[model samples]
Target: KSKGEELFAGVVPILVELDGDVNGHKFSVSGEGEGDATYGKLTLKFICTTGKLPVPFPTLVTTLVQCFSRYPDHMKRHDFFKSAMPEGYVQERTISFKDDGNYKTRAEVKFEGDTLVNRIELKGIDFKEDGNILGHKLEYNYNSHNVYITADKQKNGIKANFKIRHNIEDGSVQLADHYQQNTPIGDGPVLLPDNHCLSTQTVLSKDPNEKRDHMVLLEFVTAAGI
Candidate 1:
């Protein structure tokens, strides 16, 4: 079989894994491809507001942005695409997100007749407060390598952060930087498959109110236009 044909065949499963429902809510992606499967525009969206933290929607939006923004490069190297491809037909879609001033985050996708096109915009709260200044300030971190957009574990002027292992190709994660050094949890070094890698938020207990039992990701992806 041709390279792309094999690629898509394996991709469908990866999509399911990556889309693993965040708190029972699914992360989503969409796009349209050409008969040749070489070009297309894809959209992504993540609607997770049930099983985890209930605030800071903006942080969630940005996280999805980082996931959906990567195209051809991410798609080609995606763990799934590394295996197979599909035959006959192409599809596309676009996903979006929003908060109605309520506590829940809603995500939606726009599917084209044959393909998909759209994006997700997270409009959330801006958290203010680090170890210093002793006051809350709105903040959201957009990193090329890191996870846990906002780790609320704070106590005695210490908090934690986590970097979910999204791309092993980046190879910068190290456990020493985390469990061993003076570095705060927010300054994590391990590239964990999930919360297994611990970081901090300058807070002591990690928002005791937030869920800490499972992998709650706010990730999404857009399709590559054919």
Candidate 2:
């Protein structure tokens, strides 16, 4: 376990597969390539449903990567909340809590189209405005568990640097990223709810040809405090 911990103590490698039937059509997904990871830091990559095969929208990719390193647990909870908030993008209310002494926290969840966004801030007698703006964004797929993250291009931040393969049986991960390109960080192969069938119909109706009917997503990592 120490080896595993040491391996993941900094940065590790991982792979995620996503596959399922969308409207009777079969589809599958594997990592676009390998990626880096640590216990507190991990990144996954994949193609986007909206773009040509293997290619993804740059902005969304960045947004997803950023989210993974910031809010891992909340990202994992996206699927659960999706089912709980059927008719609404948001939960319709804000939740607050109080801790041991002078600590308090408040948060609200919202879905802006394909993205699940949230802001959780601690409250006290004093705080820094911009620093306390703590929040994250997850650009999600309409028909699958895929999601992404983005930020301004001018911003200086971490980007993909290698490829990855998850060896679950052996409990090992591999990495290899030659071009060091930025790709979508896919999460989930979550099963679409049966009752949500008609939900995506409106989006499908617009395509007409149904080229984007099927979708696949990779894995999402937990968010580290940023």
Candidate 3:
């Protein structure tokens, strides 16, 4: 146990830009190592550009972790269970994707076991600034997996897509699988609500005894600015 930072294998760093440098944002593993037995221990460190955004207290963080990995099994997890909780919001709500033809992008950050997956989706809309885009009116016909990411330009776009996915075979980590699109590069910038980054944790498992429905809680921390 004298390894300090060298004890366990190191994980590749995962970085995301919520907005622009003005709304500075960073997410890192802070530090991690072997936990006791069945489960390994790791700490996720989050840093924001502006102090204006409110960071979630540890209590809320723990609650989210419990909900995603403990009580329930896999089958019960759905849209309702996989979303963010009360303290969760783009400070209050996930940005709506109701535009008619403007532009939309969805950045996905997830950890299932020790692997982290980062993805960005570009959505094209016909939004007319004169109105609002209803949830039902939002289209999910084209989506992409961000196969290869670069400095600013995101190539390999997809079509008619929405939502993320996670299955047991993928190492207990969450995943997003949708109809692959043929386009290259994202439509434009993704509007992430809340000042928070998207934090995903477990709430339940497939253990029959837990009885509670399986859930995966996603937390969106603040970027606070573009």
Residue 2, model 2: lDDT of 22
lDDT of 1 at 14: 14
Clashes of each: 61, 19, 44
RMSD of each: 17.6, 21.3, 17.5
How many residue pairs of model 1 clash at the backbone? 61
lDDT of 2 at 152: 17
Q: What TM-score, to 2 decimals, does candidate 3 have?
A: 0.22
Please report, in order, the local distance difference test score of every candidate based on alpha carbons.
0.24, 0.24, 0.24
What lDDT tens digits, residue by residue, belong to model 1 across residues 62-145? 222111222254334321221111211111112121111111222222223322222332222222222111121123222332
Task: Supply candidate 3's per-residue lDDT for 150.
Answer: 16
Off by over 4 Å in 3: 1-10, 20-44, 54-103, 106-156, 163-226
After superposition, which runs of candidate 1 have C-alpha atoms over 4 Å from their true positions? 1-54, 62-114, 117-141, 146-226
- TM-score of each model, paired residue for residue: 0.22, 0.23, 0.22
Per-residue CA lDDT of model 3 for 36-120, tens digit only, reads 1112222333233333222111211221121121112221221111132211111111222222222233444433334332333
- Candidate number achieving the greatest TM-score relative to the actual structure: 2
